[PDB]
Design a protein around this ligand. Structure first.
Ligand SMILES: O=C(N[C@@H]1CCN(c2ccc(Cl)cn2)C1)c1nc(C2CC2)ccc1Nc1cncnc1
Ligand SMILES: [Mg+2]
Ligand SMILES: [Zn+2]
Length: 313
């Protein structure tokens, strides 16, 4: 109860910032996550013995892949931490609880392959879940760990609140299917621009949480250039491996997943910042102004990718 977590001064300061990198010391990441839950939610939110055990079962069920790994799970929870800390009054006690756990669980048991590849490969998960194939798997894994013994971190909630929080987490994890981002933002854009957006509307709240999850999921594009640059290597490591597996199915992959088409990556990143990233943080800033630093950082990396094409690096 009186056992606070405390980080070194540089991390204690820098972890409040949006562009925070959790660093290469894996054994610190669980403590970083418990510090964030304590500040963002409260020392009373979770039983420390259960949370710690929950955290370590989740870690175990992430795989050793270049990008969609344990570090990504924690990085995505940090972004969600920063948003909730800068938007202090807007979110309920169950949301702040649900959302940090949703972020940590969002990519449980990821194999480094897109939904497309599972469909074309005719993976068993594709027959079980026809859309948002991995995301439904991710949520299924989350429920599996919650139900392990001594892992029910929500055991103080009423039966009804417990159902609410698992509904928050399900929708939250499904929203990280990028296929669903495009329509979600467009609907939020119109609701803002016609001025009919309404945070008391539960249908509206879900969409906003959906956008927050995309924002957090893509947050490697909102770091200082060196972190974003080096994370781009890990993502394409996964992309190029999948392309190889596409070729093995007798399918020429899209250039994004073809390693013989590295030259085209800089231009591919512009399209992505223009088509996906900037629109995502713009709309998010419009609905939550104190998230503006995610937009600024995103623009800074977009500018850096233009410099790459101009041969200045
Ligand atoms: O870039 C991403 N998608 C782009 C789509 C088009 N792109 C493309 C097109 C043509 C060529 Cl020839 C090369 N590439 C790539 C990306 N996607 C995801 C989720 C799987 C959806 C997450 C992060 C991402 N970027 C990222 C950048 N930096 C640090 N971390 C992640
Ligand atoms: Mg995912
Ligand atoms: Zn993810």
């Amino acid at each position: 109860g009186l056992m606070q977590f405390t980080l070194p001064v540089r991390l204690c300061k820098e972890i409040e910032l949006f562009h925070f990198d959790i660093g290469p010391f894996e054994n610190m990441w669980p403590g970083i996550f418990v510090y964030m839950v304590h500040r963002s939610c409260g020392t009373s939110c979770f039983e420390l013995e259960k949370l710690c055990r929950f955290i370590m079962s989740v870690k175990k069920n992430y795989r050793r892949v270049p990008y969609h790994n344990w570090k990504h799970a924690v990085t995505v929870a940090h972004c969600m931490y920063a948003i909730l800390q800068n938007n202090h009054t807007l979110f309920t006690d169950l949301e702040r609880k649900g959302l940090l756990i949703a972020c940590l669980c969002h990519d449980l048991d990821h194999r480094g392959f897109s939904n497309s590849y599972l469909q074309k490969f005719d993976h068993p998960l594709a027959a079980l879940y026809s859309t948002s194939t991995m995301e439904q798997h991710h949520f299924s894994q989350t429920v599996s760990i919650l139900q392990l013994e001594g892992h029910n971190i929500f055991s103080t909630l009423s039966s009804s609140e417990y159902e609410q929080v698992l509904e928050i987490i399900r929708k939250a994890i499904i929203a990280t299917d990028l296929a669903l981002y495009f329509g979600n933002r467009k609907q939020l854009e119109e609701m803002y621009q016609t001025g009919s957006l309404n945070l008391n509307n539960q249908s509206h709240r879900d969409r906003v949480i959906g956008l927050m999850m995309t924002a957090c999921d893509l947050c490697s594009v909102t770091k200082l250039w060196p972190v974003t640059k080096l994370t781009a290597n890990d993502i394409y490591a996964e992309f190029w491996a999948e392309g190889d597996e596409m070729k093995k199915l007798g399918i020429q992959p899209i250039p994004m997943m073809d390693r013989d088409k590295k030259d085209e990556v800089p231009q591919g990143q512009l399209g992505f910042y223009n088509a996906v990233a900037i629109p995502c943080y713009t709309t998010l800033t419009q609905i939550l102004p104190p998230t503006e630093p995610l937009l600024k950082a995103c623009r800074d990396n977009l500018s850096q990718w233009e410099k790459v094409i101009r041969g200045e690096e």
